[PDB]
Amino acid sequence: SVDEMLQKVSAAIEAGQNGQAVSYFRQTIALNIDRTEMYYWTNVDKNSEISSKLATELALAYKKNRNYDKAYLFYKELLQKAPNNVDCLEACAEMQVCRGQEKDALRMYEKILQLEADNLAANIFLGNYYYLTAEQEKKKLETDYKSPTKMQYARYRDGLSKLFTTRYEKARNSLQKVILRFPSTEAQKTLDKILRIEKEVN
Ligand SMILES: [Zn+2]
Ligand SMILES: [Zn+2]
């Protein structure tokens, strides 16, 4: 039973054997994640070092189960203990993207860049975000134009220029920091496509 397993976790914590406490805690998540979650809120001392270990296991467990609401709750519980930790911010941001909170997820990634300019995780997401969002805007711009009048053609090419400097520029800035010291085929294949779109728009 899970209730018996949880007493071993409680005993291992009081005996100073944190290693086996986390091991039995991981096994209780497999048996019953709902009851284990309740044990964390009711019995675990939130001011101890072990608290963060137990919270991380529940966050990882809900993330694998596709329950993005619960995964966020626990990554947020970790984030309260260290608000400026880029790795803690990264974990919450990914769950907000999966839940559909696009705007709030965009904020957390931008906050990571403020704390660390060359952060690998934030620059990967944003580099792809701006490139993909600028690609759909470029298709909308071409579908409207493609009589025609040269005034409308001026407005068409100006849209391509404005969208490039505003959106594509931010995509390339993030993608260059990604391949600063760690090469990537996924990063370099996008940079040549941005370079291709640049010479067409002038
Ligand atoms: Zn991550
Ligand atoms: Zn760095």
Side-chain angles (χ1 to χ4, degrees), residues 1-7 9-48 50-65 67-76 78-144 146-154 156-168 170-202:
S1 180
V2 299
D3 294 11
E4 301 298 333
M5 290 273 292
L6 294 172
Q7 294 191 37
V9 175
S10 295
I13 291 169
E14 296 176 4
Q17 299 175 341
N18 293 13
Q20 67 178 26
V22 180
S23 298
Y24 286 115
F25 191 85
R26 274 189 287 259
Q27 293 175 11
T28 63
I29 293 178
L31 297 172
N32 189 0
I33 193 175
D34 185 32
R35 183 62 182 85
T36 301
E37 191 192 335
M38 191 169 294
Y39 171 84
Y40 173 87
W41 297 117
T42 56
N43 300 38
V44 175
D45 180 1
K46 309 307 180 298
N47 297 346
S48 63
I50 193 63
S51 183
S52 298
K53 298 289 184 179
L54 304 182
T56 303
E57 301 299 342
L58 289 165
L60 291 164
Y62 288 113
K63 180 167 64 60
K64 294 178 70 176
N65 298 345
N67 182 353
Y68 305 114
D69 297 335
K70 289 288 185 178
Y72 175 73
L73 187 63
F74 287 101
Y75 283 124
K76 186 182 176 183
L78 292 169
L79 192 61
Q80 288 181 344
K81 298 181 178 64
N84 301 337
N85 189 317
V86 294
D87 297 4
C88 302
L89 290 170
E90 175 184 332
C92 299
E94 291 174 9
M95 299 304 76
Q96 294 289 48
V97 177
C98 293
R99 289 176 64 194
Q101 299 294 341
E102 186 181 359
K103 195 166 187 298
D104 191 22
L106 193 70
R107 181 185 61 80
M108 300 194 72
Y109 282 117
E110 198 173 14
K111 185 180 182 183
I112 286 175
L113 296 180
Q114 190 175 17
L115 294 169
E116 182 176 13
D118 69 322
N119 189 249
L120 194 64
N123 289 310
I124 288 167
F125 180 83
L126 295 168
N128 297 334
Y129 178 81
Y130 292 116
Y131 176 75
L132 292 170
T133 53
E135 196 68 24
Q136 60 182 336
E137 292 287 1
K138 182 176 179 296
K139 186 179 178 181
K140 182 182 180 300
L141 181 54
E142 293 170 17
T143 308
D144 295 7
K146 299 191 292 71
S147 177
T149 302
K150 62 191 175 184
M151 175 52 171
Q152 298 174 0
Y153 183 76
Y156 160 72
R157 285 295 197 90
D158 277 306
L160 295 178
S161 183
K162 200 71 169 59
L163 187 285
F164 186 84
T165 56
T166 307
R167 198 163 286 273
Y168 280 90
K170 297 177 181 176
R172 185 169 60 179
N173 183 34
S174 300
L175 292 166
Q176 285 176 354
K177 295 181 183 180
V178 175
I179 65 175
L180 182 60
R181 41 188 160 188
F182 306 118
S184 181
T185 305
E186 191 66 14
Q188 274 288 4
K189 70 86 65 59
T190 302
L191 292 176
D192 64 49
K193 288 183 291 179
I194 295 177
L195 183 60
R196 190 193 304 174
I197 294 172
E198 188 176 24
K199 66 78 166 60
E200 294 175 15
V201 183
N202 304 329

